[PDB]
RNA sequence: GAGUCCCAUAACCUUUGUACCCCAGAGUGAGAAA
RNA sequence: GGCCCAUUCGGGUCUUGUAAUUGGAAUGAGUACAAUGUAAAUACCUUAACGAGGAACAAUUGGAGGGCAAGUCUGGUGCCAG
């Protein structure tokens, strides 16, 4: 990687991505749907 | 040697070339038990003659 | 939820009695609380499907064994009928 | 002793091209020195050959070291210009090798010179 | 028939692969790491007794 | 996947001497006798610890046949911390010097091999890690280094050739303990072609019960390679019964 | 052809799937028919076996048995012996099926596009078109598959869904 | 350490593709008293049954249960001792042979197993993919071997 | 499946509330109410117990821990 | 004795006078302790005491 | 009363400046020139 | 998410699913200018033109399971069971 993409947690380096936060968003959002149905 | 551009559209196929160039020398001094350099020498004449091609 | 008359609560024995960063790191904390959400929907979902091949297995094994138990029935017939 | 070792006779040089000549027909032959080092290390190649009459000789020395270091078998022949003319190719080959393949229609003859080629190292 | 058959093998061969590990060229390209986990407690060696 | 500026959190393994790299995917791992280089390019891991940098290197189970055995789930490795280790096969330090990584300072690895060119590498590798002696000779021949070996807790093979069971025979007799291990890796292919290789795996087996070894386990290496296992056993003198 | 002697067998079903997956067969009826042309010819060198050694029978029928495998192409040159005529398995007349030659000498990517290559009149063996998948190739045979000179693939005008195409696309 | 043993990979479902000619038959040693009642030759009927070369197995189990059997069976111990049948050595204590032979079979899948006994017969039929071979009538048969 | 042709084997559509009723909501099925009548019994058997607990509870009952709680 | 030999026919002594050697017509060859309870073992000098 | 002991002699981010870069990667593999 | 094992609890494995869209090629049945064939003729073989996306140019037979109603029938210890 990038040396700026190289983070002091995998927390930092996943919530850079942003495919893989707007997948849980779209999910996210479908099980309350369900939930607080 | 692309990070510190030892070797270094058309200066690349110098690149390219110069690079096999090098990779052939290390194996004719690498093996050979006390290398000599009139292969060396031969060698980059080749490369010069390129040189002036392009 | 079920809530006890207080007079049935108050009269109980001791054993059962009923106890009644900002910013950067909320998106960071909310996250955390999304993703484990997600992983326990997909777990009761993966978890209940076994079930249901379960009572699906249970059912198709339950009619080999009827099969299996009846048939040694008849063996038992021919094998002492010669006794 | 030789540099260039083990050296095939003249017969066992002839079963080899034969399967060299065919299995560039059949795409499963990658040809010269930087295909032969690219194979090893994919570890796709059955073996290489090698031209033992090479200018300079050492410049395909190093395959060897990365063959047994697979325990890829290996070998060298006398004339690089008879490879290419087996090989298909209008220039010299000075190395070649072949490339795996349990669906080739050749896995008997490419086994069966392997075999050979074994019982020669 | 044919085309039936053929849609079962590829079939098999899925379930092959769940029931037992097949081999598929090694490795290509980088070594990524086991995709699924190293499982610590697991031994899948035949034992000699 | 495993790419250089990410973290992973490194754990203990069954056997002592290895760990377990996780994070988005896991890695065999183990702590390296030689910080600051790759033997042949492998992957490393650094750790600040109270502050030193202490240092370890990926396991490639496509390119070592042990790490692949060990995946693939062995019971038994008697390689471990403070223990000496014969290796028949040094071919090169890719999988030497992780077994030398395993045994540790206090313990050694006695590499043999055969041919020069290989072996020339095996000795620069070899120096690096002070408990390596590169042993560049014949293994069908122990007596003609008998003088650079004493006993060996447990013996490894990866020797490609179709007599390998003689040569692990008068190895084990010469240098292995009583009760030792030995772990053998056995290629069909290279032993017999024309059966099948699972005919050839109970033959060898046979072999090594001929030559007082109790076989214990046998693990096909699937799928980092075809038609491959390894064999763990134990060199019982007293009797196999 | 005849039927097994036991057709419902579980390892034999799983036979005869991997088999016709591997080699892309119709049904089981070209798999029993290889079959028991195996048997025939493990049967004869089954009881030139059992003849004395130097039996002139033995010899003789033995020898040109052999040499017509060898033929075939199932037994290779170095196995000219009864014992390696035993030892043979259907697959490797299966592997002698056209099919497996035009797949694995690459003109077909697939038994299945080899197949209907070979059935749509595409593939020739000398001054021959083959439309029969089951046509066993001799070795010499083998170097000679080619697409045929009337084929598209083989050296002759578009088909017919080409130039219809190249015409509807003129206009 | 919960262990988990791998499945052969010689085996294809119940399919053993690994098995080819020539076969492994251990031999048992009631199949030995069965095939001299019959009078059928252990090689001859093993290569007719199988129209494959057989090569025949006798561990030092079954040679042990043989030959304890007594001067009865004095016959049995000879034909048994046929220089065509080649003899398996054994590391375990026991002299059962019933077990010697299940695990060995459980562990290597190129093995035929020859046997009347109807304890053993059921438990080689478990186990997957291993050709079951006995005597009846008046040669012998083959049951889970698909190349027939 | 035997002898049952698939128009034999038909789904049969769910009727809706009707729209003068809306308001109250959705129309109960008979796998609605056995939820609803399960959910009662359920919580009526553990009050049930609570109860028959309570009563017959000791007076002279003495657990230690009583002096922190 | 033992059911597996079947009829004696040669025996001999060990010439260290140590074991027994046994040849039976059902085809083996036996060895045995010519004292069953001592073992062939060096003994310490308190043993042998 | 109170973590020196993770270099405020420092790390990280932002702005400015200087010098270079916009090819494949487990790189492809027979054309190029006319 | 898919799949495998397992009476039981559970255990094991990883590129999968589409009941989604889309592209250009191949050709047989057929239909047929013909020729050949034949006492003549049918048929076979060869061969101009046309001849495929639901390629509706619409092969079958058998077996194992589901699930659905403001529906219907029957025995009961509500709300169950067949």
New interface residues.
Partial sequence: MNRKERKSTILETLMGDEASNKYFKRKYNEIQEKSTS | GAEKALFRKNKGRISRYLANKCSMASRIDNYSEEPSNVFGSVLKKQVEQRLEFY | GLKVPKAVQKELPFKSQIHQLGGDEKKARSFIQKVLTISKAKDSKRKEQKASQRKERLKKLAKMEEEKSQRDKEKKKEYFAQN | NP?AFPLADAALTQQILDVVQQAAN??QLKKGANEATKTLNR?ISEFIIMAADCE?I?????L??LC??K?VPYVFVPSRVALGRACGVSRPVIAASITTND???IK?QI??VK?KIETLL | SRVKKRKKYQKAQKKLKSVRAVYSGGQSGVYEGEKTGIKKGLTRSVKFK | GARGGAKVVIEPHRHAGVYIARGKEDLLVTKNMAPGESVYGEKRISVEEPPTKVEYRVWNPFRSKLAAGIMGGLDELFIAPGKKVLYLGAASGTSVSHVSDVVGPEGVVYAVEFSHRPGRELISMAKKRPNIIPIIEDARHPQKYRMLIGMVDCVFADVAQPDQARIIALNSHMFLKDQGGVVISIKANCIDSTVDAETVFAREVQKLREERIKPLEQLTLEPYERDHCIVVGRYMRSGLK | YSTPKRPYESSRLDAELKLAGEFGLKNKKEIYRISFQLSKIRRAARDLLTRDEKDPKRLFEGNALIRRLVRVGVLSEDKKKLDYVLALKVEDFLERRLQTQVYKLGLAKSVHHARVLITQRHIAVGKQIVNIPSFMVRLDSEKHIDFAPTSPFGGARPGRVARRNAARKAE | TRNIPQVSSALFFQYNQAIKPPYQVLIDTNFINFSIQKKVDIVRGMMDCLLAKCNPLITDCVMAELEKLGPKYRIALKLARDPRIKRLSCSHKGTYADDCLVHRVLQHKCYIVATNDAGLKQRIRKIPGIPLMSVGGHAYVIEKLPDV | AKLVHDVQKKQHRERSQLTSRSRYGFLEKHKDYVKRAQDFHRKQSTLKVLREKAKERNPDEYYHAMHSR | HTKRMQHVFQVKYSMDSKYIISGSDDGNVRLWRSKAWERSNVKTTREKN
């Fill in positions: 540099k059949l795409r570890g300079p050492e410049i395909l020395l190093h060897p070291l047994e270091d325990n669906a080739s229609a008997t086994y069966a075999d």
